[PDB]
Enzyme design. Sequence first.
Site, PDB file in Angstrom:
ATOM      1  N   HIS A 190       0.575   7.625   2.059  1.00 16.55           N
ATOM      2  CA  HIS A 190      -0.679   8.340   2.258  1.00 16.55           C
ATOM      3  C   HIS A 190      -0.673   8.978   3.647  1.00 16.55           C
ATOM      4  O   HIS A 190       0.154   8.654   4.497  1.00 16.55           O
ATOM      5  CB  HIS A 190      -1.880   7.359   2.164  1.00 16.55           C
ATOM      6  CG  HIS A 190      -1.874   6.330   3.253  1.00 16.55           C
ATOM      7  ND1 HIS A 190      -1.007   5.257   3.266  1.00 16.55           N
ATOM      8  CD2 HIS A 190      -2.613   6.215   4.389  1.00 16.55           C
ATOM      9  CE1 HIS A 190      -1.202   4.542   4.351  1.00 16.55           C
ATOM     10  NE2 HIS A 190      -2.173   5.110   5.064  1.00 16.55           N
ATOM     11  N   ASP A 211      -3.652   9.563   6.723  1.00 14.09           N
ATOM     12  CA  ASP A 211      -4.912   8.934   7.081  1.00 14.09           C
ATOM     13  C   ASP A 211      -6.091   9.892   7.000  1.00 14.09           C
ATOM     14  O   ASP A 211      -6.039  11.084   7.290  1.00 14.09           O
ATOM     15  CB  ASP A 211      -4.885   8.368   8.504  1.00 14.09           C
ATOM     16  CG  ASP A 211      -4.058   7.106   8.622  1.00 14.09           C
ATOM     17  OD1 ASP A 211      -3.539   6.670   7.570  1.00 14.09           O
ATOM     18  OD2 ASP A 211      -3.966   6.530   9.718  1.00 14.09           O
ATOM     19  N   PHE A 231       0.873  -1.179   0.000  1.00 13.84           N
ATOM     20  CA  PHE A 231       0.000   0.000   0.000  1.00 13.84           C
ATOM     21  C   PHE A 231       0.907   1.225   0.000  1.00 13.84           C
ATOM     22  O   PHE A 231       1.854   1.292   0.788  1.00 13.84           O
ATOM     23  CB  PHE A 231      -0.993   0.014   1.147  1.00 13.84           C
ATOM     24  CG  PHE A 231      -2.122   1.002   1.054  1.00 13.84           C
ATOM     25  CD1 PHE A 231      -3.195   0.773   0.199  1.00 13.84           C
ATOM     26  CD2 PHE A 231      -2.150   2.155   1.826  1.00 13.84           C
ATOM     27  CE1 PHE A 231      -4.257   1.664   0.117  1.00 13.84           C
ATOM     28  CE2 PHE A 231      -3.200   3.044   1.751  1.00 13.84           C
ATOM     29  CZ  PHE A 231      -4.265   2.809   0.899  1.00 13.84           C
ATOM     30  N   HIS A 236       2.845   7.663   5.662  1.00 14.62           N
ATOM     31  CA  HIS A 236       3.318   6.307   5.925  1.00 14.62           C
ATOM     32  C   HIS A 236       2.878   5.378   4.805  1.00 14.62           C
ATOM     33  O   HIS A 236       2.030   5.745   3.974  1.00 14.62           O
ATOM     34  CB  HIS A 236       2.855   5.828   7.305  1.00 14.62           C
ATOM     35  CG  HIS A 236       1.371   5.925   7.488  1.00 14.62           C
ATOM     36  ND1 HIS A 236       0.706   7.113   7.700  1.00 14.62           N
ATOM     37  CD2 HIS A 236       0.426   4.957   7.471  1.00 14.62           C
ATOM     38  CE1 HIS A 236      -0.588   6.859   7.811  1.00 14.62           C
ATOM     39  NE2 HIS A 236      -0.798   5.553   7.686  1.00 14.62           N
TER      40      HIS A 236
HETATM   41  C1  LIG Z   1      -2.183   0.962   7.379  1.00 14.77           C
HETATM   42  C2  LIG Z   1      -3.306   0.070   7.962  1.00 14.77           C
HETATM   43  C3  LIG Z   1      -4.256   0.991   8.748  1.00 14.77           C
HETATM   44  C4  LIG Z   1      -4.045  -0.500   6.711  1.00 14.77           C
HETATM   45  N1  LIG Z   1      -4.447   0.526   5.750  1.00 14.77           N
HETATM   46  C5  LIG Z   1      -5.693   1.046   5.709  1.00 14.77           C
HETATM   47  O1  LIG Z   1      -6.559   0.584   6.422  1.00 14.77           O
HETATM   48  C6  LIG Z   1      -5.903   2.154   4.667  1.00 14.77           C
HETATM   49  C7  LIG Z   1      -4.872   3.274   4.853  1.00 14.77           C
HETATM   50  S1  LIG Z   1      -4.994   4.047   6.502  1.00 14.77           S
HETATM   51  N2  LIG Z   1      -7.234   2.716   4.920  1.00 14.77           N
HETATM   52  C8  LIG Z   1      -8.244   2.794   4.067  1.00 14.77           C
HETATM   53  O2  LIG Z   1      -8.124   2.210   3.003  1.00 14.77           O
HETATM   54  C9  LIG Z   1      -9.495   3.523   4.526  1.00 14.77           C
HETATM   55  C10 LIG Z   1     -10.572   2.465   4.811  1.00 14.77           C
HETATM   56  C11 LIG Z   1     -11.832   3.221   5.262  1.00 14.77           C
HETATM   57  C12 LIG Z   1     -13.022   2.306   5.549  1.00 14.77           C
HETATM   58  N3  LIG Z   1     -13.376   1.426   4.249  1.00 14.77           N
HETATM   59  C13 LIG Z   1     -14.245   3.095   6.017  1.00 14.77           C
HETATM   60  O3  LIG Z   1     -15.241   3.090   5.252  1.00 14.77           O
HETATM   61  O4  LIG Z   1     -14.125   3.713   7.074  1.00 14.77           O
HETATM   62  C14 LIG Z   1      -3.201  -1.583   6.016  1.00 14.77           C
HETATM   63  O5  LIG Z   1      -2.678  -2.439   6.751  1.00 14.77           O
HETATM   64  O6  LIG Z   1      -3.056  -1.577   4.784  1.00 14.77           O
HETATM   65 FE   LIG Z   2      -2.797   4.787   7.144  1.00 21.14          FE
END
Ligand SMILES: CC(C)[C@@H](NC(=O)[C@H](CS)NC(=O)CCC[C@H](N)C(=O)O)C(=O)O
Ligand SMILES: [Fe+3]
Length: 329
Positions: free
Chosen positions: A212, A214, A209, A268
């Site tokens: 980005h 948050d 990933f 991150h």
């Molecule tokens: C970095 C971790 C938090 C995780 N990444 C993540 O969860 C990534 C980046 S923070 N986050 C997202 O995609 C947002 C999801 C939001 C969720 N569908 C909602 O509707 O609220 C990973 O392990 O990839």
């Molecule tokens: Fe994140």
Amino acid sequence: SVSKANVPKIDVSPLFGDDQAAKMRVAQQIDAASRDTGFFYAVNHGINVQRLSQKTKEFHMSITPEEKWDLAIRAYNKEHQDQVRAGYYLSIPGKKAVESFCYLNPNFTPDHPRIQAKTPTHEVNVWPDETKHPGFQDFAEQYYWDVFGLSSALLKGYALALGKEENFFARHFKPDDTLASVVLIRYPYLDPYPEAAIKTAADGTKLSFEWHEDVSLITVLYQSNVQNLQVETAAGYQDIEADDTGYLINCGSYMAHLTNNYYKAPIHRVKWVNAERQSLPFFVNLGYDSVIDPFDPREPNGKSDREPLSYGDYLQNGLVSLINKNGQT
Ligand SMILES: CC(C)[C@@H](NC(=O)[C@H](CS)NC(=O)CCC[C@H](N)C(=O)O)C(=O)O
Ligand SMILES: [Fe+3]
């Protein structure tokens, strides 16, 4: 090699009690970490994370392809037009390794006023069949409230850290309307691991990933004991050590906006690791109409040249932007 990021372990237990001086000393630790790399581990948090991991593993390893389609978000199943956020996010063997299950506030029932109004970002959770996954829904809903409780305590520490009263953020984080979500993410072990599911950073690092900030006020994360996260600092990207006994905490871009970047939303990314592991974030989101007036704790009058932004507007647009930038998860 890559340097290790400074990620202090902070005993957050005083934030659940009434020793005001002890709470201020915790707030100072939060302030220091937020001004440095932007990450810390919350320890002595009171949540049974081993049981969370066990129940999550039982779910991920027993759900079937049939159930995944039946629970799928709109991005994977056009029949489920109401499921933008909540439901199953499928893997695509040979192309996309990650898969996950997202759920929202359990109080978002069919009779909730925001569900009746069809307000964006509010949805009624979808759950697998109880007979196939005995106790899962009940466990997951209770986990939402346990991590909500930890998050409320953390928000008291952030408010005190910023020179505010302890309910400054927490007064907008309420059980009846929070937009907070839990995501149960499965990162699998695969042999052979598809190259199409591996991204490459400009510095050559293999990622799952990309970089980005948050979309949250704060992010409260449990992960298995497999190192994977990196944070960008002035010295470049540094590795965040894993700790499967604590919660990794960081600020999101709503906090950066409110504080005029005093508490930055750290950039991150997630390294690619060929290991079966879990990533279980709780995104601390406020209510749809919550508005906190921006300020600046570095300025003598505390004023900032930023305009107030409602949390619902922030969230709807942030989640779409993150998908456009880093792909549909
Ligand atoms: C970095 C971790 C938090 C995780 N990444 C993540 O969860 C990534 C980046 S923070 N986050 C997202 O995609 C947002 C999801 C939001 C969720 N569908 C909602 O509707 O609220 C990973 O392990 O990839
Ligand atoms: Fe994140």
